[PDB]
Curated annotation (Swiss-Prot):
The gene is GFP. Changing A204K: Abolishes the tendency to dimerize and leads to monomeric fluorescent proteins. Changing Y143C: In mut1.9; shifts fluorescence lifetime from 3.03 to 2.74 ns. Disulfide bonds: none annotated. This is Green fluorescent protein. Energy-transfer acceptor. Its role is to transduce the blue chemiluminescence of the protein aequorin into green fluorescent light by energy transfer. Fluoresces in vivo upon receiving energy from the Ca(2+)-activated photoprotein aequorin. Changing I126V: In EBFP2.0; shifts the excitation and emission spectra to shorter wavelengths and increases quantum yields compared to BFP.
């Protein structure tokens, strides 16, 4: 295998996610747990709002709540920055602009803590409309397929990504969320700096029928693409 970190993902890897958020002063925390199987680009996660009621729609947090679990085809193995940063991990930073509404800024560390892949996130949201699609909870509980466009950032020894998320509104219209992303290794080791490609990212949201707490069950299937065999 072409990076040391890539070997850490040949099997099923337990995952922990911890998020602390503050959006227009509405504070919340989310904890998630599950497992990833990057061989197949798959993961399964269950998230709980540990502070009670989530003040923003669950779909708006999907992208923030581990692209190291992507399946890179055999011919694209030299382009997997995410696994190559492991186990020291990477900082993942975004700004996410909700069209005609506010923005989230996120900073996350994704790294191994023992045998667990851990995503620890801080999120700050500002300039939201209290009666908008976000703070007004007007988004459908579903998720569209999206491509995440990745380019190398030689300078920061890292990558950049941008993409637009389409969140379905309750009336069948769409709330757009423009994502800008930077990832930089935490560790000192060499990392793989990719040619241009994308992650074909499929997400399915559901509820655990036995769960009383405000929650989201998420299954994802992601494969890298865009470089011809
Ligand atoms: Gd697809
Ligand atoms: Gd797919």
């Amino acid at each position: 295998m072409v990076s040391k970190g890539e070997e850490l993902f040949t099997g099923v890897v337990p995952i922990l996610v911890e998020l602390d958020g503050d959006v227009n002063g509405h504070k919340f925390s989310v904890s998630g747990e599950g497992e990833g199987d990057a061989t197949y680009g798959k993961l399964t996660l269950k998230f709980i709002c540990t502070t009670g009621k989530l003040p923003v729609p669950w779909p708006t947090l999907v992208t923030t709540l581990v692209q190291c679990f992507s399946r890179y085809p055999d011919h694209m193995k030299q382009h997997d920055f995410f696994k190559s940063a492991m186990p020291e991990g990477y900082v993942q930073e975004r700004t996410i602009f909700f069209k005609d509404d506010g923005n989230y800024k996120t900073r996350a560390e994704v790294k191994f803590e023992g045998d667990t892949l851990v995503n620890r996130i801080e999120l700050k949201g500002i300039d939201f409309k209290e009666d908008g699609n976000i703070l007004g909870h007007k988004l459908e509980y579903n998720y569209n397929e999206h491509n995440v466009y990745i380019t190398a950032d030689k300078q920061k020894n890292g990558i950049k990504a941008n993409f637009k998320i389409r969140h379905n509104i309750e009336d069948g219209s769409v709330q757009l969320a423009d994502h800008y992303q930077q990832n930089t290794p935490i560790g000192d080791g060499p990392v793989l700096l990719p040619d241009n490609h994308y992650l074909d990212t499929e997400s399915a949201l559901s509820k655990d029928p036995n769960e009383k707490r405000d929650h989201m069950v998420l299954l994802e299937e992601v494969e890298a693409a865009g470089i011809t065999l």
